[PDB]
Design a protein around this ligand. Structure first.
Ligand SMILES: CCCCCCCCCCCCCCCCCC(=O)OC[C@H](COP(=O)([O-])OCC(O)COP(=O)([O-])OC[C@@H](COC(=O)CCCCCCCCCCCCCCCCC)OC(=O)CCCCCCCCCCCCCCCCC)OC(=O)CCCCCCCCCCCCCCCCC
Ligand SMILES: CCCCCCCCCCCCCCCCCC(=O)OC[C@H](COP(=O)([O-])OCC(O)COP(=O)([O-])OC[C@@H](COC(=O)CCCCCCCCCCCCCCCCC)OC(=O)CCCCCCCCCCCCCCCCC)OC(=O)CCCCCCCCCCCCCCCCC
Ligand SMILES: CCCCCCCCCCCCCCCCCC(=O)OC[C@H](COP(=O)([O-])OCC(O)COP(=O)([O-])OC[C@@H](COC(=O)CCCCCCCCCCCCCCCCC)OC(=O)CCCCCCCCCCCCCCCCC)OC(=O)CCCCCCCCCCCCCCCCC
Ligand SMILES: CCCCCCCCCCCCCCCCC[C@@H](O)O[C@H](CO[C@H](O)CCCCCCCCCCCCCCC)COP(=O)(O)OCC[N+](C)(C)C
Ligand SMILES: CCCCCCCCCCCCCCCCC[C@@H](O)O[C@H](CO[C@H](O)CCCCCCCCCCCCCCC)COP(=O)(O)OCC[N+](C)(C)C
Ligand SMILES: CCCCCCCCCCCCCCCCC[C@@H](O)O[C@H](CO[C@H](O)CCCCCCCCCCCCCCC)COP(=O)(O)OCC[N+](C)(C)C
Ligand SMILES: CCCCCCCC/C=C\CCCCCCCC(=O)OC[C@H](COP(=O)(O)OCCN)OC(=O)CCCCCCC/C=C\CCCCCCCC
Ligand SMILES: CCCCCCCC/C=C\CCCCCCCC(=O)OC[C@H](COP(=O)(O)OCCN)OC(=O)CCCCCCC/C=C\CCCCCCCC
Ligand SMILES: CCCCCCCCCCCCCCCCCC(=O)OC[C@H](COP(=O)(O)OCCN)OC(=O)CCCCCCCCCCCCCCCCC
Lengths: 69, 53, 54, 347, 140, 121, 459, 56, 99
């Protein structure tokens, strides 16, 4: 029965090790992503939560009717 | 929500009217043209949060 | 069987909740469809939002 | 109404909504709202009768008041900032006015009565278009101006919408009023998630639109506008009743159907922001919506109501008009839970 | 409403029971006034006197519930010398529920209100102690 | 809005040029197979509603259903993968550029860590 | 796990593409084959679980439940083919499809490695069950029974969803292996109390706990025979499996929060046995006996010792088999006389001898008769409860006495005495019914022969 | 005739081929978790002269 | 009457048409083959083969392995005068208590 239907314990042992590594790395990444999202939303110094401001290319710098702008 | 067709196609449909420091007829200046220009040039490219801070 | 299972375990959790939901449903849905009434409601809501929310 | 006039009015409604969704100017957004309402009134009054006229009158009054408040908010914002671009609003008073105006346009409580009234008043096609598109536009404006939304006011109106939709749908027997209260509850859920994740707002909008389209098209196929009229559909075309049953189960948020995905994602997102009481209350309150969905399912597919004698002639005859994208809407509203991570594509 | 809640919270938990009762009465009266305004708007009275009577009834019911809640909770905490204990808020909530039942002349309403209001007030106290927030500020 | 307004974002672009550097989804992707299954279910429901033989009728129509679903699913999967890769890129960049906000911590063994013991009795 | 999952998703098209008269034969044959295939999961390790992939894993707790589900499907098919003779081909295929979907969801539930996927699947199990009950129930009360069942389960389970997403946000993962290895103590706080409450209350409603159990008589009495079989045998075991899984992260708060649930379980075990003593409906008697047994299982899980968990697992398996057999016997009686009243049909021993033998064996297994696995589980739970405290022995003895009393009361009422004179349509027992009883009873005795297969990971 | 038997009894291969496909997919899933194969401290060893991997 | 309703049909007996009925199907051949497949597969295949398979399942729980290891440890510890059961699971030298 063991020869025909089942494998050795090394396969299950090492597959379990690989699964544990993957899941632990995923948990670490999730926590780090939450921290990054919090910091980015609080500070606005990253690529996230960059709400639009007014483009400065719309400003007309040509001389006006009045000298003092 | 906001499909920026104007930015994508290079069209200008209301950006000419959005602000008072833009191109005005006969180069008539706004009341606060200098202040709006200064604020816009300060806040350009840094986002809303940093612009307000 | 009767006093606990068929009466009070039914009265506490499932029956009272269903009765409350039915009463609230009747209260919400019992409207005469009058624009004067619910526009007065709109005015009250606007005043409350303006004053009590800051 | 001439078919050319009807299609040009539909094109004008869509043009108003698209103008709202593409404009960067508050005046142009208001223009889009006005054009949408102007072309939408005759669509409501297409099949002329006193009920349709009254529904159109109530809709016009509500939308006109909302537009007046919206333009007042725009002007007040301009006064304190001199800005016409749609961004974070610079005045809290103007932001409150804009929030109330957009909530009134959407139908969020306590601005909801017109939704069941008009939906009952107008036909099935008009109700479908109304719900879907007229929720599509103001939600776009709110998503654009989300970062200045007052969380207290938005969440208050959202929770009120959820509760009121649940209770009203509990009481109603008319299918159009049931759909209207369902719309109120779903709008409540969406605006509840709005101040945190506009992506989740859009996801809930898409799933709600798919389910609503499927349900309305099934009702049009069966030509049933009441519970008892729908109770006769099992004796003519039993497939439509089964599809309606699974769609109703999905709309109630039962796993593993498509309706569970928006609730699940919204609860997760609100939990990420240290909100527990609000997600728990919202999850518990939806059981009212599930109850009246289940009551509707009992009458139509899970039981056999008595029928009549001319149903034999109805058997002899066959449905002519073909609904467009009905199978796609039925599949998308029940079997897209495994495809949840596409919300990143939606981002 | 925020000012009234701030006054009530600024009054210390186990002391100044008369001031606690007054603040809770004010909060209850404001709630009753709002409820009466919505009731008059949605279900119009048959006459001005009937409308005033309905407003007075609702406002007095709410104010009595608030006064009983505040008195019971503050006095219980004071005599037990255990501030920051949800049991005091539970007792106050059940007292308010019993007051509502007496006002509405219904033993069943009184019992259900005692249970639900006691649980709600205990949860409010637990939230105050633990930092729970209903309208949480956006983050993450 | 987290990734709306990201620098360098071209509006109305389903798939930018920088997405070409990511591995495209395989044609035997389980998600693509599920999209094809959704298309097949849509075809079966269409036959059922139109009262044709559900499994036999409209083979061309069912094939078009499956093909359209697979096509849109492939492009949707490409966009989803691009967005998740972009999220990871931004997160790693922020973590690297804010070391004082993300500091390394000394790793202690459980022989040094003291954990309270709670007997089950 | 795919070697078992895919054959069910292939049972579906086989059912829908088979001929009109061959659906039952094909479904039964291939369900038995799938059960035989799933028998290979019992070869478990002494150190850890069988981690097939990132999504599915099997343990000494999951394996017997999966084997029980796969074995239960063909018996449900036999009973359904008994009571659905005049149905149309499409509706027969729809009923078989509901059973197949339920089995698939149960398999994926028992093998799910994450708590959120487990939640999704164990909530997905509600839809086929609700459809089956409210569609193929015989009486009017099926609608109310379905409403009660659905709303009890969902009002229990929604706070569990909120707690699960909160735990994922706090700890980074809902994977069971990670949460077991990275578990930290739960401090005595209101927030932790309410998290514990959310999880435990969801699974208690699923159990059901005493005071949260009316939906169980409602649904079990009014569901069709296959629905009654699946509700008692497997669907009640989702709560116990979940409690044995979640309690990893709920310590040491389980020492202090378990008192009300232990008191409810013990006293309601006594009360439901007493209710069984005075039931005028046979299905209701079986349902309340199920409630008492699951209350004992709750006591075991709450006291939470290695001796209690083994007893809990053994009692769950034994109760599943015994309750399924009792429901089948009562359903045969109902199909005879078209009424569920216990005192309507009497003298059934002199009218149907071998069915009287099946009733006797089922009743002897229902009460803890040594060396049956029912008694093994009950005795392990009683010993663990004795170590917990020394008046639990008083409560357990009272419960055992009442259990024997009502079991033998049911046996004597239905089988002994003199037959009802005017009931003259009791045809001889069918080969199908006899085979159903034999397939219910023989595996229980073989499990008695080999008991370490159902004692769980704590063995 | 023979055609009718195949026309009717062709559904009896669906479950067996599903079992075969499930075994194949189980092998495919297992072959993606080979990152610690012959790397655990407990089962690490030197390969035999005529083998490439410890398990599959 | 309030409806045009069918009368409740009489109960159908399978033994009337087919005296040697197994209770599976109305059709005699289908019923016989249903009985045959149920009995063969269930009883023979599942019961007998699964029971012997479970009986001869390999000792993957390492019960006998643990017993042999225990025998070796007991022999070694009683030969050298060491305690049969060690006082601590881990090494106190490798454990570092707080001050
Ligand atoms: C952001 C800005 C937003 C906007 C802000 C604007 C601010 C500036 C406004 C400037 C001025 C604008 C002037 C024009 C406004 C429009 C006027 C109009 O068209 O009115 C038509 C409208 C109805 O027209 P109609 O159909 O011809 O009239 C029918 C007849 O009245 C015959 O009716 P009846 O025979 O059926 O009964 C008579 C009467 C019967 O009346 C009643 O039953 C009402 C009883 C009110 C009691 C008030 C108690 C106040 C207590 C305060 C707190 C102290 C402690 C109290 C403790 C308890 C005491 C008991 O009315 C009703 O029954 C109708 C139902 C509604 C009555 C009340 C309407 C007001 C709103 C609802 C809330 C009212 C207060 C509720 C209590 C809560 C207060 C916080 O008229 C009225 O509602 C009353 C007359 C107009 C008064 C206007 C006053 C200014 C409003 C602003
Ligand atoms: C196959 C498993 C599917 C599992 C779920 C997957 C997702 C859904 C499937 C997609 C949609 C399928 C079509 C739906 C309509 C079907 C209509 C019908 O009669 O169908 C019979 C039709 C044959 O009959 P026909 O001669 O064409 O026409 C007879 C009339 O239709 C006769 O019509 P009638 O006039 O007698 O109609 C009356 C009947 C009408 O009833 C129906 O039409 C029932 C079906 C429609 C209801 C909704 C279906 C699901 C839609 C999505 C919603 C979520 C689904 C998942 C839910 C999970 C939680 C429950 O109504 C009633 O009996 C009322 C009482 C029952 C109501 C309460 C129960 C409702 C249950 C709702 C949920 C059902 C879920 C499973 C559905 C499976 C359907 C086949 O057979 C099929 O459609 C079988 C399915 C397709 C098989 C393809 C096989 C291909 C070759 C083998 C491939 C092997 C694998 C490939 C790999 C390589 C291997 C080597
Ligand atoms: C009313 C009389 C009463 O309090 O009866 C309690 C009694 C519990 O049994 P017990 O042996 O007296 O409690 C032991 C200790 O007194 C209390 O245990 P402890 O002092 O060791 O501390 C643990 C305590 C920690 O205490 C707290 O957490 C107190 C703060 C409020 C917690 C509220 C949790 C609500 C959970 C959902 C309940 C749905 C019902 O845990 C609980 O309070 C557990 C709450 C959930 C109990 C079972 C829920 C199902 C009831 C089924 C029948 C429903 C009718 O009965 C009930 O809870 C149900 C019947 C009365 C309603
Ligand atoms: C139906 C719903 C469930 C029915 C009630 C279930 C049993 C509840 C029994 C009351 C719980 C008593 C206990 O749990 O809390 C005590 C006080 O309970 C609360 O103050 C009252 C909550 C509301 C109770 C509603 C049920 C009505 C019971 C009324 C009497 C309960 C208190 C009895 C005197 C203590 C103080 O215990 P303590 O050792 O500090 O642990 C607190 C946790 N800390 C340490 C983090 C702070
Ligand atoms: C140079 C010559 C070649 C040019 C090539 C063309 C370049 C692209 C052209 C795109 C089409 C032209 C414009 C037509 C409208 C554009 C629509 C789309 O392309 O835009 C994208 C939008 O893409 C869609 O959002 C993704 C559609 C995803 C559909 C599924 C949603 C996920 C549902 C979850 C469950 C899935 C179930 C399975 C579904 C079948 C991003 O545009 P963006 O300006 O940034 O949007 C702003 C609003 N935001 C920021 C809030 C988003
Ligand atoms: C005096 C009164 C005595 C009366 C006793 C009557 C029984 C006759 C005596 C017993 C039979 C002789 C002994 C047989 C025994 O040895 O086999 C048992 C084995 O029995 C089977 O394992 C029981 C199989 C139970 C599982 C049946 C599954 C069939 C499908 C059912 C599915 C539903 C199950 C749901 C839960 C899993 C015990 O295992 P074990 O002593 O070591 O075998 C020795 C061989 N070794 C050394 C190689 C190990
Ligand atoms: C959490 C669970 C807490 C458990 C508390 C259960 C409440 C115990 C009281 C039950 C007994 C009361 C009673 O018999 O009826 C009261 C009464 C009469 O209705 P019945 O017709 O008898 O209901 C049967 C319907 N078929 O019904 C009510 O519930 C009164 C309405 C409640 C007052 C409003 C609640 C106020 C709470 C405010 C915060 C929420
Ligand atoms: C009416 C009275 C109703 C009483 C029953 C309660 C059900 C109403 C739900 C409303 C929420 C009430 C409890 C709120 C508990 C809560 O939110 O906190 C739990 C905690 C909050 O921690 P933080 O916010 O991060 O605080 C940080 C500290 N620095 O979060 C969690 O642990 C998740 C818990 C999920 C909420 C659980 C709420 C329900 C409590 C369990 C009851 C289960 C009932 C099941 C129903 C079946 C029988 C009816
Ligand atoms: C006819 C009736 C309508 C149903 C048609 C179903 C099949 C449609 C597709 C036909 C084949 C198209 C094709 O070329 O597919 C190949 C492609 C994978 O190819 P590729 O990955 O390049 O090769 C392996 C390299 N390692 O394959 C893919 O990318 C897979 C995409 C398709 C997924 C299909 C999922 C199931 C669809 C329903 C199948 C129904 C079968 C039974 C029909 C009975 C009709 C009576």
């Amino acid at each position: 029965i063991a020869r025909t239907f089942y494998d050795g314990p090394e396969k299950n042992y090492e597959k379990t090790m690989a699964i544990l590594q993957i899941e632990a790395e995923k948990a670490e990444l999730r926590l780090k992503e939450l921290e990054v999202r919090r910091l980015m939303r609080a500070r606005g110094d990253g690529p996230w939560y960059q709400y639009p401001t007014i483009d400065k290319a719309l400003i007309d710098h040509s001389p006006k009717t009045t000298p003092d702008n | 929500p906001f499909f920026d067709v104007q930015k994508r196609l290079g069209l200008d449909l209301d950006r000419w009217m959005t602000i008072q420091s833009a191109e005005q007829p006969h180069k008539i200046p706004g009341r606060c043209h200098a202040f709006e220009k200064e604020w816009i040039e300060c806040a350009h490219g840094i986002g809303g949060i940093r612009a307000e801070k | 069987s009767s006093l606990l299972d068929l009466i009070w375990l039914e009265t506490i959790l499932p029956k009272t909740t269903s009765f409350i939901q039915m009463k609230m449903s009747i209260m919400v849905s019992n409207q005469k469809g009058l624009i004067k009434l619910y526009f007065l409601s709109f005015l009250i809501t606007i005043m409350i939002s303006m004053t009590l929310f800051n | 109404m001439n078919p050319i006039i009807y299609t040009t009015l539909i094109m004008t409604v869509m043009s108003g909504t698209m103008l709202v969704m593409i404009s960067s100017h508050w005046l142009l957004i208001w223009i889009g709202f006005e054009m949408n309402l102007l072309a939408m009134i005759p669509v409501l009054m297409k099949n002329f009768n006193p009920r349709a006229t009254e529904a159109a009158t109530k809709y016009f009054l509500t939308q006109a008041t909302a537009s007046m408040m919206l333009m007042m908010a725009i002007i007040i914002n301009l006064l304190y900032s001199g800005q016409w671009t749609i961004t974070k609003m610079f005045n809290p008073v103007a932001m409150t006015m804009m929030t109330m105006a957009l909530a009134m346009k959407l139908g969020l409580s306590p601005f909801h009565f017109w939704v069941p009234e008009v939906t009952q008043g107008i036909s099935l096609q008009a109700g479908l278009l109304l719900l879907t598109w007229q929720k599509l536009a103001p939600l776009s404006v709110l998503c654009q101006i989300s970062q200045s939304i007052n969380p207290n006011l938005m969440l208050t109106m959202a929770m009120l919408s959820i509760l009121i939709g649940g209770w009203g749908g509990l009481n109603q027997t008319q299918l159009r009023k049931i759909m209207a209260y369902s719309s109120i509850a779903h709008m409540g859920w969406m605006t509840a998630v709005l101040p945190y994740n506009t992506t989740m707002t859009i996801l809930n909008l898409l799933i709600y639109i798919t389910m609503t389209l499927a349900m309305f098209m099934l009702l049009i196929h069966s030509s049933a506008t009441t519970t008892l009229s729908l109770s006769h559909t099992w004796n003519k075309m039993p497939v439509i009743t089964s599809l309606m049953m699974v769609t109703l189960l999905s709309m109630g948020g039962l796993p593993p159907l498509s309706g569970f995905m928006p609730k699940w994602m919204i609860i997760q997102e609100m939990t990420k922001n240290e909100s527990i009481i609000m997600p728990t209350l919202m999850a518990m309150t939806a059981l009212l919506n599930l109850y009246f969905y289940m009551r509707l399912a009992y009458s139509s597919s899970l039981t056999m109501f008595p029928s009549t004698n001319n149903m034999k002639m109805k058997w002899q005859f066959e449905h002519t008009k073909q609904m467009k994208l009905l199978p796609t809407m039925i599949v998308l509203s029940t079997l897209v839970l495994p495809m949840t991570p596409a919300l990143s594509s939606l981002n | 409403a925020k000012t009234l809640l701030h006054k009530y919270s600024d009054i210390p938990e186990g002391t100044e029971c008369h001031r606690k009762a007054y603040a809770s009465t004010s909060i209850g009266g404001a709630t009753g006034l709002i409820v009466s305004a919505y009731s008059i708007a949605l279900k119009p009275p048959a006459s001005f006197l009937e409308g005033v009577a309905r407003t007075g009834r609702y406002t007095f019911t709410s104010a009595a519930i608030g006064a009983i809640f505040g008195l019971t909770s503050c006095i219980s905490a004071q005599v037990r010398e255990k501030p920051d204990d949800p049991l005091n808020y539970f007792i106050g909530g059940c007292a308010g529920g019993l007051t509502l039942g007496a006002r509405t002349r219904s033993y069943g309403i009184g019992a259900a209100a005692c249970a639900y209001m006691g649980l709600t007030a205990a949860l409010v106290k637990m939230g105050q102690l633990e930092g729970w927030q209903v309208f949480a500020e956006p983050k993450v | 809005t987290m990734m709306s307004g990201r620098p360098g974002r071209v509006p109305l672009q389903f798939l930018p040029n920088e997405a070409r550097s990511l591995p495209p989804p395989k044609l035997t992707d389980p998600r693509l197979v599920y999209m094809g299954f959704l298309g097949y279910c849509s075809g079966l429901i269409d036959n059922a509603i139109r009262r044709r033989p559900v499994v036999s009728a409209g083979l061309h129509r069912q094939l078009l259903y499956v093909t359209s679903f697979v096509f849109f699913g492939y492009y949707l999967l490409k966009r989803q993968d691009y967005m998740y890769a972009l999220r990871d890129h931004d997160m790693f960049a922020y973590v690297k550029s804010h070391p004082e906000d993300f500091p390394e911590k000394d790793k202690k063994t459980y022989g040094e860590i003291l954990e309270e013991f709670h007997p089950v009795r | 796990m795919l070697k078992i999952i895919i054959p069910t998703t292939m049972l579906l098209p086989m059912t829908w593409m088979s001929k009109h008269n061959m659906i039952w034969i094909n479904a039964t044959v291939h369900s038995l084959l799938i059960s035989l295939i799933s028998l290979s999961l019992l070869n478990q390790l002494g150190e850890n679980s069988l981690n097939f992939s990132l999504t599915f894993f099997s343990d000494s707790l999951s394996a017997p439940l999966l084997v029980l589900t796969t074995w239960l499907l063909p018996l449900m098919l036999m009973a359904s083919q008994s009571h659905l003779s005049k149905e149309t081909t499409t509706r027969k295929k729809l009923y078989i499809t509901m059973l197949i979907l339920l089995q698939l969801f149960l398999i994926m539930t028992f093998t799910a490695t994450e708590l959120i996927l487990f939640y999704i699947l164990f909530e997905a199990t509600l839809v086929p069950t609700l459809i089956i009950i409210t569609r193929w129930g015989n009486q009017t009360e099926r609608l109310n029974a379905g409403l009660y069942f659905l709303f009890y389960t969902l009002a229990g389970s929604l706070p569990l969803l909120v707690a699960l997403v909160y735990i994922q946000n706090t700890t980074g993962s809902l994977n069971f292996l990670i949460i077991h290895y990275w578990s930290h103590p739960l401090s005595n706080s209101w927030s932790n109390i309410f998290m514990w409450l959310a999880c435990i209350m969801a699974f208690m409603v699923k159990m059901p706990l005493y005071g949260l159990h009316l939906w169980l008589p409602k649904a079990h009495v009014e569901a069709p025979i296959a629905g009654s079989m699946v509700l008692a045998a497997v669907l009640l075991k989702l709560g116990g499996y979940g409690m044995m899984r979640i309690t990893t992260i709920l310590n040491p708060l389980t020492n202090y929060m378990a008192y009300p649930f232990l008191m409810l379980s013990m006293w309601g075990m006594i009360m439901t046995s007493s209710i069984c003593l005075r039931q005028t409906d046979l299905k209701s008697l079986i349902a309340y006996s199920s409630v008492s047994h699951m209350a004992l299982v709750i006591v075991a899980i709450m006291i939470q010792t290695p001796w209690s968990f083994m007893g809990a697992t053994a009692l769950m398996i034994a109760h599943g088999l015994t309750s399924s057999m009792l429901f089948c016997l009562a359903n045969t009686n109902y199909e005879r006389v078209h009424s569920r009243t216990m005192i309507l049909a009497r003298g059934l021993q002199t009218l149907l001898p071998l069915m009287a033998t099946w009733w006797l064996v089922a009743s002897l297994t229902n009460l803890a008769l040594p060396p049956s696995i029912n008694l093994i589980g009950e005795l392990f739970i009683i010993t663990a409860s004795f170590s917990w405290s020394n008046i639990t022995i008083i409560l357990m003895g009272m419960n055992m006495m009442i259990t024997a009393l009502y079991s033998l009361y049911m046996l004597i009422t239905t089988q002994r005495g003199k037959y009802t004179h005017h009931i003259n349509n009791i045809k001889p027992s069918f080969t199908r019914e006899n085979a159903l009883m034999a397939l219910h009873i023989l595996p229980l005795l073989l499990l008695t022969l080999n008991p370490k297969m159902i004692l769980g990971p704590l063995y | 005739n023979v055609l009718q038997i195949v026309r009717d009894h062709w559904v009896h291969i669906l479950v067996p081929v599903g079992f075969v496909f499930g075994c194949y997919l189980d092998r495919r899933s297992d072959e993606k978790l080979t990152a610690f194969r012959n790397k655990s401290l407990l089962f690490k060893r030197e390969l035999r002269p005529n083998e490439e991997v410890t398990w599959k | 009457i309030r409806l045009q309703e069918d009368p409740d049909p009489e109960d159908e007996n399978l033994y009337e048409k087919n005296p040697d009925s197994h209770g599976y199907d109305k059709d005699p051949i289908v019923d016989l083959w249903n009985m045959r497949v149920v009995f063969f597969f269930g009883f023979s295949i599942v019961l007998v083969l699964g029971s012997t398979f479970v009986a001869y399942l390999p000792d993957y729980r390492m019960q006998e392995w643990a017993r042999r290891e225990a025998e070796r440890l007991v022999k070694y510890r009683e030969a050298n005068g060491l305690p049969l059961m060690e006082s601590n699971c881990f090494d106190p030298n490798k454990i570092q208590l707080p001050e």
